[PDB]
Amino acid sequence: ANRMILNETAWFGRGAVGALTDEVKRRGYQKALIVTDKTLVQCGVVAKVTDKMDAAGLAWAIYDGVVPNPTITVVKEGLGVFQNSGADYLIAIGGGSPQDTCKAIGIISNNPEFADVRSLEGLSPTNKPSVPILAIPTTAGTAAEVTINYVITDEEKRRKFVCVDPHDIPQVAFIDADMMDGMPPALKAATGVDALTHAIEGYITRGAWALTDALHIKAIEIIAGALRGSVAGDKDAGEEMALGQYVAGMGISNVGLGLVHGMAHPLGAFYNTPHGVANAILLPHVMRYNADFTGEKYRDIARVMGVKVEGMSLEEARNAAVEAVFALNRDVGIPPHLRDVGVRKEDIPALAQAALDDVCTGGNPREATLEDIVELYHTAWTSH
Amino acid sequence: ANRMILNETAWFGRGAVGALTDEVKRRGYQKALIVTDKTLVQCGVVAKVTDKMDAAGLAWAIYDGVVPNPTITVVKEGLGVFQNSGADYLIAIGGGSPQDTCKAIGIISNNPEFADVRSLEGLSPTNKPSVPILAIPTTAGTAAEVTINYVITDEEKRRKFVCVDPHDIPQVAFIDADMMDGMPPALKAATGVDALTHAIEGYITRGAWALTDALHIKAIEIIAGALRGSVAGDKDAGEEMALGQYVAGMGISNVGLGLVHGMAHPLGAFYNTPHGVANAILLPHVMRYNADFTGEKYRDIARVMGVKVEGMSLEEARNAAVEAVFALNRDVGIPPHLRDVGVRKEDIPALAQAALDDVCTGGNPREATLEDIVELYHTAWTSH
Ligand SMILES: NC(=O)c1ccc[n+]([C@@H]2O[C@H](COP(=O)([O-])OP(=O)(O)OC[C@H]3O[C@@H](n4cnc5c(N)ncnc54)[C@H](O)[C@@H]3O)[C@@H](O)[C@H]2O)c1
Ligand SMILES: NC(=O)c1ccc[n+]([C@@H]2O[C@H](COP(=O)([O-])OP(=O)(O)OC[C@H]3O[C@@H](n4cnc5c(N)ncnc54)[C@H](O)[C@@H]3O)[C@@H](O)[C@H]2O)c1
Ligand SMILES: [Fe+3]
Ligand SMILES: [Fe+3]
């Protein structure tokens, strides 16, 4: 049988964060710790929520120390602020980095033996649910609000590790494009192709089944239809992206991903490469590698990305799907090569071993070898 | 903004009830009350679960007093059995009648001021979550495992009332076609068209939006593809129906239904008409009434029900969608007219007023008048 874990409650649309004060009152919570980053404070995104909490008389404290690719140090620091805050629940405001930090803090607070953080890797053997989390994404996005995963950087071991735990699922997600509009265009582009990567990898993952296929192919259609417009500042395209990125995540931890996420993680660990950019650059190269092991599915991807697939051979349809992703990447300004974002050719074998061992790689529809992954990093790296 | 309430956890596929004992152990529950009916006990469906609970050392008691269109008496009796059982959680085994009884018992147990049952009608202002519910459907089906609705019969007032409450959502749903295979063919047919009715009414309801549209049109495709095969005894078609009926419900408590459910409820109240049969007979007539208020949506319905819509006008595609439902109803043996199932012509004005006032009718895409509903009952009552 197949398990699906989802948010019990989610609010969607512009103004969805307007539901937060009523949700808090209905659940009887007394005081939030907001887990966020300095950019979202500076840009006034956090205040979109705290102004509503202030108006409703709801108490809050803030931890804004999160950094991209959040580290063991960031988790321990946030946990310290949580323990001293008197908060009884968490509000995660931000992209995957704050949402994942918030999950780690919530889990460790109710499972204090995991305070070393390393011990959470894999199927975390936690006995207690997380401190309740209300999740408010500000990128479009990682869908960290709806997965049971969170990804922490071990700086000493130079690796990103995935923690998988039904105990971390947020109680309520608020998916509000008003919270996302202020992303710089390059951040809309990269988080949007990360969303597309979740949807494509989820569509073709070894564990795929009927329900996740239906969700993923709809997410691909929405994201491919909306991302150019959203990057360009179209308000309705932004609302479409907010929905598409969420639907794209409804399979990440229910069925799995593949070698794109497997190869993106070591770039985050080695260089602090932004997750979205890493996935975007890799995606079409990994799609080419996987193409002949994905049945009819690239014909479906090409069709919903606007390709006229009528009369194409399966290989022509596969080539068209890959080309549609290369074209979208160019069209929203994704750097074309890993050399452009400071990846070092001499690191490729170490990156490839880290990718081969990444849990995401296990879902890949083509069984990857070390040599295959080395060649893929070279293909993605090269100016030629 | 649009709210989605879903099961936090759901297991899908033949053998999904095999997950139940581990879910109970992980949640630390001590003793179940199983809420079911005498038929499911007698035919050994309940033992499929209790044999597994016995093997795992999990305590249970049973209330099997549920009858179709469960009444205030059934709820009060089951509440009494629950209170005396020492159970700390509920397991609902059955179709909508046991699932809805279980929701009422769980809500009242934690919100004892609603012990009159009538007071639960509408948006129940309960302060506390239900006693935890694990939901196991045996029909395909009402999707009562995933909606926030439950429907109780007031025998004294001769009316069915709808209770809508986020607090009643089951913690875990187990969607297992092994639990459904014993439905007689006529029961597969009627519960299957009830599922189709959820999916069609949910697709065209006033509150419809992008996510529920995606779920409902996929549910229509699955159900229209599988129902004839499932009624004929095909095991794989039965598993398809188990998924389709669930997806059909993911939309409905989140966006609403329409006049088919509004007109079906008074038939259940007046005559004890089976819910699925009532919906099936009404569905194509109400679809014809609603057709010109549904934009392009009947072209989508006709297409996924196997109609070649290429080259049809929208009005031709609307007619084709209605005809596809008439054809399905004939093919799975739904009685063609309300007179066939003991509906009295002289009751039509009283039925019509009850339907006009039913909360489901408020979602109908065409604003219904008393006169319109009277005419629709007449159209459905005999051949013209
Ligand atoms: N299942 C999961 O939990 C899951 C899924 C995939 C990714 N991840 C993790 O998510 C992280 C990446 O998250 P991300 O891609 O959302 O980026 P991020 O959270 O790392 O943020 C990237 C940058 O964008 C800024 N930013 C975010 N929202 C903004 C806004 N609205 N306006 C202005 N600036 C804004 C941040 O301040 C930061 O500088 C990685 O660590 C990745 O491994 C986890
Ligand atoms: N909760 C909601 O959102 C919701 C939605 C729709 C319908 N409903 C309600 O659900 C009820 C109808 O439920 P239903 O249509 O599932 O039927 P049901 O639960 O009333 O059962 C009908 C008959 O089928 C039998 N049966 C059920 N499963 C069987 C199996 N596997 N093998 C053999 N016999 C089996 C029952 O014992 C009974 O005799 C109505 O009261 C309706 O109002 C509620
Ligand atoms: Fe990602
Ligand atoms: Fe129904």
Side-chain angles (χ1 to χ4, degrees):
Chain A
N2 291 297
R3 191 183 61 191
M4 298 288 294
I5 298 172
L6 296 174
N7 303 116
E8 181 179 275
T9 312
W11 287 90
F12 298 85
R14 291 183 176 283
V17 300
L20 180 139
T21 61
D22 282 347
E23 290 293 349
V24 170
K25 288 180 160 159
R26 282 177 215 145
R27 292 157 196 274
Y29 306 149
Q30 296 307 299
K31 184 174 177 182
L33 181 72
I34 293 169
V35 174
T36 193
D37 69 34
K38 222 48 134 144
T39 303
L40 293 167
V41 170
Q42 291 162 346
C43 288
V45 171
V46 172
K48 295 179 187 286
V49 173
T50 64
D51 287 353
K52 294 188 191 299
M53 292 181 72
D54 290 343
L58 299 185
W60 57 271
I62 183 159
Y63 174 62
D64 61 6
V66 175
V67 299
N69 301 309
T71 61
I72 293 167
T73 301
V74 163
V75 168
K76 292 185 181 171
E77 178 181 71
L79 177 63
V81 172
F82 184 76
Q83 290 165 337
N84 288 308
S85 72
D88 63 346
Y89 76 109
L90 288 154
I91 305 168
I93 305 176
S97 296
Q99 291 198 65
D100 283 6
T101 304
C102 191
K103 281 174 164 173
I105 292 165
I107 286 289
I108 299 164
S109 188
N110 276 353
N111 304 272
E113 69 268 31
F114 293 97
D116 66 291
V117 187
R118 286 183 174 144
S119 54
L120 291 162
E121 174 174 12
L123 297 179
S124 322
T126 57
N127 298 309
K128 296 296 189 183
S130 173
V131 171
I133 300 168
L134 270 43
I136 308 176
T138 68
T139 68
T142 65
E145 60 272 19
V146 70
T147 77
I148 63 164
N149 297 347
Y150 54 102
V151 184
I152 302 306
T153 300
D154 190 334
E155 292 190 281
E156 284 184 358
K157 297 196 203 159
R158 194 169 202 208
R159 59 187 299 265
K160 279 173 60 103
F161 61 94
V162 184
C163 308
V164 181
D165 195 347
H167 281 150
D168 66 37
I169 187 73
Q171 295 304 291
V172 194
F174 306 83
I175 303 91
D176 185 344
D178 293 347
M179 300 293 290
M180 295 166 181
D181 288 333
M183 288 189 271
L187 181 67
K188 288 189 184 172
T191 68
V193 179
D194 181 40
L196 185 65
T197 303
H198 294 151
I200 290 176
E201 290 214 284
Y203 194 51
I204 68 180
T205 199
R206 285 181 176 261
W209 64 282
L211 180 55
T212 65
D213 283 353
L215 292 168
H216 289 135
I217 196 58
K218 180 55 56 170
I220 296 166
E221 185 181 17
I222 294 170
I223 295 161
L227 184 55
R228 290 175 181 84
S230 182
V231 173
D234 185 72
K235 288 202 82 60
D236 287 353
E239 191 165 19
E240 290 174 4
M241 278 305 306
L243 174 61
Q245 64 91 33
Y246 182 95
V247 174
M250 289 172 85
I252 288 167
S253 49
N254 294 315
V255 290
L257 295 170
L259 189 55
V260 188
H261 274 73
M263 289 176 75
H265 281 163
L267 301 180
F270 275 46
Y271 309 116
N272 210 23
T273 308
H275 178 75
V277 167
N279 281 287
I281 296 166
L282 287 161
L283 170 65
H285 298 294
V286 174
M287 282 178 71
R288 184 170 273 154
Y289 172 77
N290 283 343
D292 291 4
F293 297 83
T294 66
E296 278 294 313
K297 286 189 169 176
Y298 282 23
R299 187 190 295 281
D300 307 331
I301 296 175
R303 181 170 42 245
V304 303
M305 293 192 70
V307 175
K308 308 310 178 213
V309 297
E310 185 72 9
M312 286 188 173
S313 66
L314 181 51
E315 210 67 11
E316 283 165 346
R318 286 164 170 172
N319 288 340
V322 168
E323 181 46 38
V325 168
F326 277 120
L328 176 60
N329 277 356
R330 289 190 296 268
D331 289 347
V332 300
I334 305 299
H337 325 292
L338 293 177
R339 191 180 64 82
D340 304 333
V341 296
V343 177
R344 301 193 332 204
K345 179 158 55 175
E346 67 270 21
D347 287 336
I348 287 179
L351 289 168
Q353 182 64 49
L356 186 63
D357 290 333
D358 189 277
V359 62
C360 297
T361 299
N364 199 68
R366 180 170 179 181
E367 192 143 355
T369 65
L370 182 66
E371 183 44 49
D372 287 351
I373 297 173
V374 167
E375 289 181 13
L376 276 168
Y377 272 124
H378 278 279
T379 301
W381 181 85
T382 183
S383 305
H384 324 285
Chain B
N2 291 299
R3 189 186 58 194
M4 298 287 294
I5 308 290
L6 294 177
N7 302 121
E8 180 178 276
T9 313
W11 287 90
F12 298 84
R14 292 183 176 284
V17 301
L20 181 140
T21 61
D22 284 341
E23 290 293 350
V24 169
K25 288 183 173 197
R26 283 196 288 274
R27 292 187 173 60
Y29 306 149
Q30 294 309 300
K31 183 171 174 184
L33 181 73
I34 293 172
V35 176
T36 192
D37 70 36
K38 295 181 302 297
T39 302
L40 292 166
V41 171
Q42 290 171 357
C43 77
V45 171
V46 173
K48 296 183 193 288
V49 174
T50 63
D51 286 353
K52 295 188 194 297
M53 290 181 75
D54 290 343
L58 300 183
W60 58 272
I62 185 159
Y63 175 63
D64 75 344
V66 176
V67 299
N69 301 310
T71 61
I72 293 173
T73 300
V74 164
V75 169
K76 290 183 178 180
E77 179 178 348
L79 180 60
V81 171
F82 181 77
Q83 290 164 338
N84 189 73
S85 75
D88 63 345
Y89 77 110
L90 290 152
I91 304 174
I93 306 177
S97 294
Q99 301 291 332
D100 284 5
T101 302
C102 189
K103 282 172 163 174
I105 292 166
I107 287 288
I108 299 162
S109 185
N110 277 352
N111 303 274
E113 69 268 32
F114 290 90
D116 67 297
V117 188
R118 288 187 173 129
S119 56
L120 291 163
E121 178 172 14
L123 302 181
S124 324
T126 55
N127 293 318
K128 294 297 197 171
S130 174
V131 170
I133 300 169
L134 274 49
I136 307 174
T138 69
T139 69
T142 65
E145 61 274 16
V146 66
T147 76
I148 62 164
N149 300 340
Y150 55 103
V151 186
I152 305 305
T153 301
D154 188 336
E155 288 190 287
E156 289 186 357
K157 298 195 184 299
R158 194 169 203 207
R159 60 188 300 271
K160 279 173 62 103
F161 60 96
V162 186
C163 309
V164 181
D165 194 348
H167 280 152
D168 66 37
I169 188 73
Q171 297 303 292
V172 195
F174 307 82
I175 303 89
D176 185 344
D178 294 346
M179 300 295 287
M180 294 167 184
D181 288 330
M183 290 191 271
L187 181 65
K188 292 191 187 167
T191 67
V193 179
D194 178 35
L196 185 67
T197 301
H198 293 158
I200 289 174
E201 291 214 282
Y203 194 49
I204 69 179
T205 198
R206 282 183 177 262
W209 65 284
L211 179 54
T212 65
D213 283 354
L215 292 170
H216 289 135
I217 197 57
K218 180 55 60 168
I220 296 166
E221 184 187 4
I222 295 168
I223 295 162
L227 185 54
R228 292 175 178 85
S230 181
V231 171
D234 186 273
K235 284 197 83 66
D236 297 328
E239 193 166 17
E240 290 173 6
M241 280 302 309
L243 177 58
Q245 63 90 34
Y246 180 94
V247 173
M250 290 176 80
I252 68 175
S253 57
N254 289 314
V255 289
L257 293 168
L259 187 56
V260 187
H261 274 72
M263 289 175 76
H265 283 160
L267 301 180
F270 275 46
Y271 310 116
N272 209 26
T273 308
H275 176 76
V277 165
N279 283 296
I281 297 164
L282 287 160
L283 171 64
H285 300 293
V286 175
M287 282 177 67
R288 189 173 272 150
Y289 174 75
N290 284 341
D292 290 356
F293 297 81
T294 64
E296 277 290 317
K297 285 183 175 181
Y298 282 22
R299 188 190 294 283
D300 307 330
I301 298 176
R303 182 172 41 246
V304 303
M305 294 191 72
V307 176
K308 298 314 196 208
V309 295
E310 314 69 46
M312 288 187 174
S313 67
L314 176 55
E315 214 62 21
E316 288 167 346
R318 284 162 170 175
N319 181 60
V322 170
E323 286 302 337
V325 169
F326 276 120
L328 179 57
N329 277 353
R330 175 204 67 212
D331 293 347
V332 300
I334 307 298
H337 303 112
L338 293 175
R339 74 184 305 158
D340 303 336
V341 300
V343 177
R344 302 170 51 228
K345 183 160 60 166
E346 60 268 29
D347 289 335
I348 287 177
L351 289 170
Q353 184 63 47
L356 184 63
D357 291 332
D358 190 276
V359 61
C360 296
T361 299
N364 199 69
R366 180 169 179 181
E367 192 175 18
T369 65
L370 182 68
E371 297 67 29
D372 288 351
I373 297 173
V374 167
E375 289 184 10
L376 277 168
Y377 272 125
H378 279 280
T379 303
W381 186 78
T382 200
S383 58
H384 294 77

